[PDB]
Symmetry: C2
Subunit: 304 residues, 2 copies
């Protein structure tokens, strides 16, 4: 029993973190096989970030300008290239701690763990979600760029995020491991505003199923709804429209608890319309949306 | 910017997790040097847990009855002993992945990370706190016993908790690594009820300082209070009495933000008396108490 915001064990990713310095800028790199991946803005000064021409700035850099250090040991850079917004630094040594891995580009609504690092050293791990506006709400200070987001399936790490910037509103933006930003964000210090931070409806429903499994059931009611009626309420409250695909994804949780998906939607509709009246669900006073249906099944069954 | 519930990187602890089986019971063990630590209730059946005589049950066990497996490799047990509620299984091989470590017994109010495991395999990591009633609010299913709680200071892991049981109310109880339970709990399936789950006042204040540092300041007001006046309100709301020691511990956060501790107490007093009026602080709709002042400084400064 119990339900917590859980991150994946970070060991496999800790073994991949290195420090990358170019000139006066130091950030984190990810060392997989004989390649180190890092944000291309490691080649920028704070001044360059205002309007950087990355191809032009990169012409002034040679392999020996990229200082890569794994713990106390220096890595030899034998090649460098820019792929979208990431630099790939080829080193002469394969990381002996390279886990089985994949690079995946996640969809909004999906969760992942972040290993926040500074100077190539891990500081902490936390679980977050790709928001529908393509930002993440992380905890990143100066020096955290290059920290990565990932999911694990038994022994394979799927890297999905690399941290690049903080918007003036305190939210975070980054790329996948191919260097493509999530959403419309760019690696330039400009007016970049985030869109509506809508609530991930399917994740809130999954978390309500987790609450029922773990004993919190006060919000269950005598009502039902339809997908279209629920979506009229979802629109009003800036929740993502629920689709038949979301209903199908919630099938296993519905089967386990015996609560039909649309009945849980009616519970959620009442919670949106009436609030929680000073009560809590799984220790929260708001509707939590950063647990996917897969996260709920995984945590409730103890997948290793 | 940003403030998240962050756990320590779990790699150093992942390298210590093993599976321990005795008869039909399988749980987790912690392998440090040539000793494996695990809950003594690994020697019990579900029936034995009702009224176990551990010394008597242990007489029927020999070294070869304790099956210890680290990944796919079996460990040879050359001795066993019971220390309070933990068993220490001496093995013939020192764990090559033994980090620098200490065993510490934490005080209520202190936080730690838990690496939840099943069959000696890590499933997830999350941050929690020793509650004032000596329970923890974790996420533990059957098979999670022997999962540990820890803190890290640079390269030294301080182990503080080992999971042993779940009370009928869904909260968790366990021991330090010397086998002494936190609080009055016992390793017997009996009516064990938890006391009042009071709120850790000093941690709520530290989290309000984190909120100010990270931009959330709507709750700051024109008022001040005294330790005695604040404590009249703390008593009414089941909050721990604030002491001069707590005020002194908050000194660095007070110096950083320029907000006197007693002024923050007056903000907290207003929040307790009037609620949050549908507003949030650091993405929470309730007053968070599982970040210590040290956690706030650590996260806000990026300690690795």
């Amino acid at each position: 029993s119990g339900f917590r915001k859980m991150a994946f064990p970070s060991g496999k990713v800790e073994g991949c973190m290195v420090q990358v310095t170019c000139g006066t800028t130091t950030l984190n790199g990810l060392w997989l096989d004989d390649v180190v991946y890092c944000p291309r803005h490691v080649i920028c000064t704070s001044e360059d970030m205002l309007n950087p021409n990355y191809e032009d700035l990169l012409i002034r850099k040679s392999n020996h300008n990229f200082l890569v250090q794994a713990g106390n040991v220096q890595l030899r850079v034998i090649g460098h290239s820019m792929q979208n917004c990431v630099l790939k630094l080829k080193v002469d040594t394969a990381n002996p701690k390279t886990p089985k891995y994949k690079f995946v580009r996640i969809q909004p609504g999906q969760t992942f763990s972040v290993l926040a690092c500074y100077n190539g050293s891990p500081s902490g791990v936390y679980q977050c979600a790709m928001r529908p506006n393509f930002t993440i709400k992380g905890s990143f200070l100066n020096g955290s760029c290059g920290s990565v987001g990932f999911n694990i399936d038994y022994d394979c790490v799927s890297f999905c995020y690399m941290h690049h910037m903080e918007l003036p509103t305190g939210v975070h933006a980054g790329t996948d491991l191919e260097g493509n930003f999530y959403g419309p964000f760019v690696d330039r210090q400009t007016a970049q505003a985030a869109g509506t931070d809508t609530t991930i409806t399917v994740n809130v429903l999954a978390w309500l199923y987790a609450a029922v499994i773990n004993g919190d059931r006060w919000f269950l009611n005598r009502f039902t709804t339809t997908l279209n009626d629920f979506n009229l309420v979802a629109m009003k409250y800036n929740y993502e429209p629920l689709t038949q695909d979301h209903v199908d994804i919630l099938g296993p949780l519905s089967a386990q608890t015996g609560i039909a998906v649309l009945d849980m939607c009616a519970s959620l509709k009442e919670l949106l319309q009436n609030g929680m009246n000073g009560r809590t669900i799984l220790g929260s006073a708001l509707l939590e949306d950063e647990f996917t249906p897969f996260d709920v099944v995984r945590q409730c069954s103890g997948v290793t």
